[PDB]
Design brief:
Strand order of the largest sheet of chain A: 13-12-15-19-17-18
Structural class of chain A: mainly beta
Strand content of chain A: 35-45%
Helix content of chain A: under 10%
Oligomer: homotrimer
Number of helices of chain A: 3
Bound molecules: nitrite ion, copper (II) ion
Number of domains of chain A: 2
Chain lengths: 333, 333, 333
């Protein structure tokens, strides 16, 4: 096919956990879907203590933004590395086929840009991440990863083939950071990326994250930035982990339909309490809220959640159902 | 519905790995199933060396007892915190919907009790655990977790829809403990829970358990407390891990039908050697014994099994089948 | 049945990642398939730094060779422990039923041999490993493990029941090593296995591998030993991990059909980016190559891959498909 005969549509990305507008069921034929991302190296404060790291981001955020297309669309990404950055970067899409997912074709020094196109031949949610030869885990674990959703052209389906339609979607990127520590246990600090590199490698080789966070920082998805829903709303939560296993859980709810390893041609697992998303994968869980109030959304290694950062909240509006749950006798002497 | 018109049935719980009597296929309509548990803080010796910790238990055991109901029964739990304990506790049921699984409604100080009711709307095995705000992983990793089984009303089914009926059931709770160590590697000791709390947090943050045990101690499911079966018996083994991934394996056998993430509306995985139960989940495996003798049941990280404690035994009675396995030439020079 | 009336066929094993010749669809009735393996304790250099360990092998390699039979064949293994070795060894087959998978029947001191027979009643890929009572994880994590494939008699099938036929097969064994370190972090060295045993236990109990490798060493499946394929070829990659979870990923490709936990009576998962093989399991992924060039095949904990060793390469010959992926604008200022 002459790709030049296909429609082009430009997407304007939004910062996680929000997701750019899209259609679940494709309203057109295949398209070339145009995306632009600008790499930004920046300092980020990642915990309540004020620990500041040198993050490596797509489009200024950890995680990078969720891209959404349909199966057999073409993804055309303009990737820009401004001259205000100092490192070489590239991009690997787990959704794509060939050239290490794109990384072999997209190496950009500061002051360069490139445009990659690939055909999104398989439906699912997938990780994308930077992957410069010889420095791959350093870039990934500095925050340089996100996800892409390739929807089936007729939207999502349950285990019986009937439609599943979400009302809201959120993207939770989970990031393991490896902040080097001195022998006494305090975080070190570094003056340039090259001076940091050996201690960053040492820190990674412990296989023990110092921080595990949603949306780039402890508490990022709490307070005025809590996720929201109403009773009766159908919510899809896309969750990615580019480097390390996680086990999401909605405290007070379930995954009614879960694609734990993210690929929509498979039937979903039903009624999950907790699911395993392997490192290097994106997964997706669908839930219909039945009760209002505060929910926590966590990695259910509870140490990882409550001590290292992998916990967010939902605030859910609506009526309380006492048939489903009630306090018969409130706590009393 | 007026819940007061439904039958009430009181269950009398038993200590793991045994399970209270129940019916696989429901012999009545929906019921309110009444349970009582009394929290007990107590010292427990957890290894052969004599290491003693301050455990936090439901009903005196690690794990807490397995509760069994049917789908769309109501679970009504009286939770008692006697004044001989010193901490605040609560309970979260992964089977329940709303109020953080019940934890928001069940906070009991020493000398208090409460009664929670919830509708068991989804079939499967599920974790329950204590979860006091701000202290969640400490209570869970002190032993304060168990499981609940919500059976389909017509019992279990295989991947084709035909019945699966167990003859025996056992509940294996697997517990990761994080006993603080000094710099030389010896376990520390503490005089009150408050004086222990910071070192307990430090220990948990290593993400490296010091002990990983079945039924509360190294060797608990061996010797006179080995699990038992006969050749030809169908056995269901429910396995939970409230905080950390595990990978069960029956050495010398299989999981003929496994719900690795524990939810019975899904077809089971067949013929598993080993399966992954993610932290925060209960799973269930069904096996029909074909050979007598000693079996080991383990977490198949063999370091976790044989060096840190995650190993039990079955002793199986009956006839040996030389067609299935035989020594053709016994070991000889 | 009188097993003596069945055909016997002797297999001549090959060194991983290659696999002995076999038929996917069984061309005969059930057989006794005869295998011989000779245990070899030997020094192995496992990284680019020259770190040398005392490995424990089946047939001289880490992993041991892949054995291939069909469902309801009998596996008859002659296991030889020459008097040039110094330890006791045995073998456990996860494919077998009874006697701890065979280990209770196959204990061989140096200078002894034994012959075990078992019926391969369940189709799938399975781990085998040494397991001497009281020393199990030491032998396994010294390299003493491999895998066996039990094919369905009518070969592999997709999720719809139609045939899947591979053109090439490779066996990737992934090995976690725990090389003891001194306080400063250098690898220690030991003069006899008995003098090494306590520090080996200490090292294992950290649960932190020092090395995680494919085919026995960093870089083993690269360069002149890269895996190979052509565009359009169907390749099955069998992957095992006898002790620790892994998450394989083909960088630039997919698992078109994956049995993550390795058991062929289950439908495969489709279109996987990454999959979890639990410790103690073998898995298998089927892929049809669509693009030429270099691919990396990794454990997608990228620290484990690129810093600790769990990375290999494919070199794929053929035509480039610019519809599937192209550089629209090559990197430029
Ligand atoms: O289910 N909450 O930890
Ligand atoms: O990959 N399916 O969940
Ligand atoms: O399969 N036993 O370690
Ligand atoms: O959740 N099903 O195994
Ligand atoms: O997908 N590569 O790291
Ligand atoms: O065990 N089935 O992938
Ligand atoms: Cu980068
Ligand atoms: Cu990747
Ligand atoms: Cu508690
Ligand atoms: Cu929980
Ligand atoms: Cu051995
Ligand atoms: Cu084993």
């Amino acid at each position: 096919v002459d790709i030049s005969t296909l429609p082009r549509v430009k997407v304007d990305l939004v910062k996680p956990p929000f997701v750019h507008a899209h259609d679940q069921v494709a309203k057109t034929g295949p398209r070339v879907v145009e995306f632009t991302m600008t790499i930004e190296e920046k300092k980020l404060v990642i915990d309540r203590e004020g620990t500041e790291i040198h993050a490596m981001t797509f489009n200024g955020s950890v995680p990078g933004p969720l891209m959404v297309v349909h199966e057999n669309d073409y993804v055309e990404l303009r990737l820009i590395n401004p001259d205000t950055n100092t490192l070489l970067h590239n991009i690997d899409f787990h959704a794509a086929t060939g050239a290490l997912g794109g990384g072999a074709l997209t190496q950009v020094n500061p002051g360069e840009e490139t445009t990659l196109r690939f055909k999104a031949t398989k439906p699912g949610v997938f990780v994308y991440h930077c992957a410069p030869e010889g420095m791959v885990p350093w870039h990934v674990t500095s925050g340089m990863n996100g996800a892409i959703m390739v929807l089936p052209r007729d939207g999502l389906k349950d285990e019986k083939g009937q439609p599943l339609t979400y009302d809201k979607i959120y993207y939770v990127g989970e990031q393991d950071f490896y902040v080097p520590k001195d022998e006494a246990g305090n975080y070190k600090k570094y003056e340039t990326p090259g001076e940091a590199y050996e201690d960053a490698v040492k820190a990674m080789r412990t296989l023990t994250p110092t921080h595990i966070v949603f949306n780039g920082a402890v508490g990022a998805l709490t307070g005025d930035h809590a996720l929201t829903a109403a009773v009766g709303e159908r919510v899809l939560v896309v969750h990615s982990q580019a480097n390390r296993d996680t086990r999401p859980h909605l405290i007070g709810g379930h995954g009614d339909y879960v694609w734990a390893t993210g690929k929509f041609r498979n039937p979903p697992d039903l009624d999950q309490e907790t699911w395993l998303i392997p490192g290097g994968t994106a997964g997706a869980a669908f839930y219909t809220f039945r009760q209002p109030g505060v929910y926590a959304y966590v990695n259910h290694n509870l140490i990882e959640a409550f001590e290292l950062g992998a916990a967010g909240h939902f605030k859910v509006t609506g009526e309380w159902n006492d048939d489903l749950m009630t306090s018969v006798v409130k706590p009393a002497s």
